[PDB]
A paper describes a structure:
Btk is critical for the generation of calcium flux in response to receptor activation, because it activates phospholipase C-γ2 (PLC-γ2), which produces the second messengers diaceylglycerol (DAG) and inositol (1,4,5)-trisphosphate (IP3). Btk dysfunction is the cause of X-linked agammaglobulinemia, a severe disease of primary immunodeficiency. The Tec family kinases have a lipid-interaction module attached to the N terminus of a Src-like module (i.e., concatenation of an SH3 domain, an SH2 domain and a tyrosine kinase domain). The lipid-interaction module of the Tec kinases is an extended plekstrin homology (PH) domain fused to a Tec homology (TH) domain.
We determined the structure of a construct of mouse Btk spanning residues 214 to 659, which starts just before the SH3 domain and ends at the C terminus of full-length Btk. The structure resembles those described previously for autoinhibited, Src-like, non-receptor tyrosine kinases, with the SH2-kinase linker sandwiched between the SH3 domain and the small domain of the kinase (the N lobe of the kinase). The crystal structure has two molecules of Btk in the asymmetric unit, intertwined as a domain-swapped dimer in which each SH2 domain has pieces from two molecules. The domain-swapped SH2 domain packs against the large domain of the kinase (the C lobe of the kinase), but Btk lacks a Src-like C-terminal tail to stabilize this interaction. When compared with the other autoinhibited SH3-SH2-kinase structures (c-Src, Hck, c-Abl), the conserved features of the SH3/linker interaction in Btk are the polyproline type-II helix conformation adopted by residues 383–387 in the SH2-kinase linker, including the proline at position 385, and the overall hydrophobic character of the peptide-binding pocket on the SH3 domain. Diffuse electron density for the SH2 domain at every stage of our structure determination shows that this part of the polypeptide chain occupies a range of positions and adopts multiple local conformations. The unphosphorylated activation loop of Btk folds into the mouth of the catalytic cleft, blocking part of the substrate-binding site, and helix αC lies at the margin of the N lobe, preventing formation of a Glu-Lys salt bridge conserved in all catalytically active protein kinases. Glu 445, which would buttress Lys 430 in the active conformation, interacts instead with Arg 544 and Tyr 545. Leu 390 of the linker (corresponding to Trp 260 in c-Src) is sandwiched between residues Trp 421 and Tyr 461 in the kinase domain. The structure just described demonstrates that the SH3-SH2 domain in a Tec-family member can assemble into a regulatory clamp, just as it does in other Src-like kinases.
Numbering used by the authors:
A (entry chain A), B (entry chain A): 214 to 295, 301 to 308, 315 to 322, 329 to 337, 344 to 657
Write the structure that this text describes.
Amino acid sequence: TELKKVVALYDYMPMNANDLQLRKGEEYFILEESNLPWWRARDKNGQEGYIPSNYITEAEDSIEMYEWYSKHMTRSQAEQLLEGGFIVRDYTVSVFAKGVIRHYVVCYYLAEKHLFSTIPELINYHQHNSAGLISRLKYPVSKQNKNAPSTAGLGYGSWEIDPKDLTFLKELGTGQFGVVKYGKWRGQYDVAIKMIREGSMSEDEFIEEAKVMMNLSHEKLVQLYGVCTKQRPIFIITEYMANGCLLNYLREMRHRFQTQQLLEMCKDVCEAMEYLESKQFLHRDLAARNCLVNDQGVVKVSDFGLSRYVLDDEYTSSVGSKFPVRWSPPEVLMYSKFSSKSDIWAFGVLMWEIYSLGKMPYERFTNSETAEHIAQGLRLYRPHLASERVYTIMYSCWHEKADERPSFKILLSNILDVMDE
Amino acid sequence: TELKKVVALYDYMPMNANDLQLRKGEEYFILEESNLPWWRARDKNGQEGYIPSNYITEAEDSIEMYEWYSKHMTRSQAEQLLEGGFIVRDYTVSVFAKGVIRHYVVCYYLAEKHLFSTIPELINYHQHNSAGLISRLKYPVSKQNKNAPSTAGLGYGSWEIDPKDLTFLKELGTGQFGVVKYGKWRGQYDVAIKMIREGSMSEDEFIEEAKVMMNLSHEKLVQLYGVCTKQRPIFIITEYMANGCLLNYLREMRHRFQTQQLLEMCKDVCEAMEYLESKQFLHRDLAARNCLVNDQGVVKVSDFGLSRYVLDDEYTSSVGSKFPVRWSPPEVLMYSKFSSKSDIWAFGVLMWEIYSLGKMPYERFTNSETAEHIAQGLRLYRPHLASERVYTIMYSCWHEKADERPSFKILLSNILDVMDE
Ligand SMILES: [Au+]
Ligand SMILES: [Au+]
Ligand SMILES: [Au+]
Ligand SMILES: [Au+]
């Protein structure tokens, strides 16, 4: 069929009339191959004759041809011969530097790569050369709504909020302590203002401890901006969450999210609970009703610690008619022993709330019924939207022994893990 | 001591008179650090005030700052947002391509490298960018005396050599068969011309088998160019070796080489013996006296097979007074059984010759004495210039059992191995 092509490695002047002249670099076609050291070839012009089979290589870009390459010339010999002057040998690329020689083994690639000290250096490189990537880095992707974080206070050193700077724009809700209205502070920044009905809380004890809660800053943690004592009944001012509480969101705003966003809702809360855990600050009543959702769908936890200052015994007492029994572990129901682990238990139930899109935990049971059955070993079943792995996480929160339950550090790790899928 | 420097990740307008204005990208100096969410900072202008500690990063080029970076935005979310448009996330570089997204894990380096299909591609790349190498490839190293290989014949299809084309330039030596003169063929190419005294060889048998030896081409193999029958006594024409035989070179040309070049002398011969082995062609009398050295110090083997056609019984007979007893294994001395293994044995002795700079093997002993002692188990001691590893190689050639001796393939491998050091 087709003729085998070769390249002349060396010049060859014909020694007689049988010979064909070879010119280095030029290409020739074999008419007759053989174990013999002479082959019958054809010039690129059509001229024919015999050429030394050792003076030629095979068809595509072989190696003996180019400048550098030096077969089996030892490392020592290559060093004697050898800024940036190089050669390749049996592979290995040897280079002269300042005087010294650097050797790089070729396995086609060296072995190592560009060793950048920082990510920005890496990015700067591939913005100039694709060097192995699918395309040169050309355009960094945007974030239409960047949004700055929350400041621990509305300016430095201001717990007191002057209601002259508060414009009551819209009523939004009606929390357990009073009417939650929405407004701008100094007619610029959005702020949620929560009325506290008199008698609801022991103001003196609460407000003094709000000073601490002020200095609790975290991106997934509904920022407490301040309070006002002059205007009574009082008013705690907090970060504005445009989509209201998570429970109502899970139930009445289902068109606003996909089931693949649920795990992220858990992650958001978990990041927040890790923070409160690190500050050894117990939330005391973690539940979907106490998480809020902002304009961008981010879930943040609110009303953390707030139950310590509720005067209504029916909320505080573990035997009370409105106590969060359905979110409470056995140790809280039996001996009112709150701890990080009680928050973790609550989180498990909160995870369940999220994945059942806001269904009431143990909805068939009474609070005392739930208490008894939990204590026996009744655990919330897997919601349909929760995968085996996700359920394993929320279930771990419900271990009857407190110290055997994960930490929010651990849970956060586990959640980011399945998010990968 | 020195003030801690930071960069503003976001703008911050002062909300009151305690606050210091932050401008994204600009740098600020901390006067007071703290677990509190507000830090006391200093403008690059000297202005002071409090800034949100969450609005700033630490001193050197952190990460949240640049365009791309997106913290913990899952692979799926990054895909929805995302030719060559990119972002970096927790690391991983995600890139848009044509539409599809390619993900590269950053461990700072990706994981892989430029994957070239050929060495010439590799070299072409680093000639433009040093990309991790000590310097960009700039200048390929030279080879002053390149020199073309040997052609199996002086032109295609010419065993017969017309002595009218031969210019007898200089006498050189005086081989066992006759005077070796040096000359140019057609007053151009250098050629060695070896006179064959009449009666020395059985010409008819030899010359006919020289036709085969003609088509034995190898770079470390003294090329047999041709013969002439018309002029008698005859004349075999061969490749010209300017430095004569290796034995005399090892003894009288010691100023011309270093001991580090010895292993290369062995390698050269071994490459040649591998070739003759592959062509199942026995050398029959391998020894330093039968190797030649060219102008560039390269050692090549000559007179291969030639002993089959020597008429003098005292050379051929294993009991003869001039038989190569000192280079012969037991099986050759006892039963005249030549094979590849007999050549390997000879090579071992040749290695010894080289590393004792041409000393006579068993010089104290007579040929019959050597024969007896070899047969008992006397082996040549390690010469001082031979390392333990080199000696191990030449020693392997001397195993009393033939089939237990290495092949020239194996030996070649072993020699290139210690050459590395
Ligand atoms: Au107020
Ligand atoms: Au149930
Ligand atoms: Au002649
Ligand atoms: Au000895």
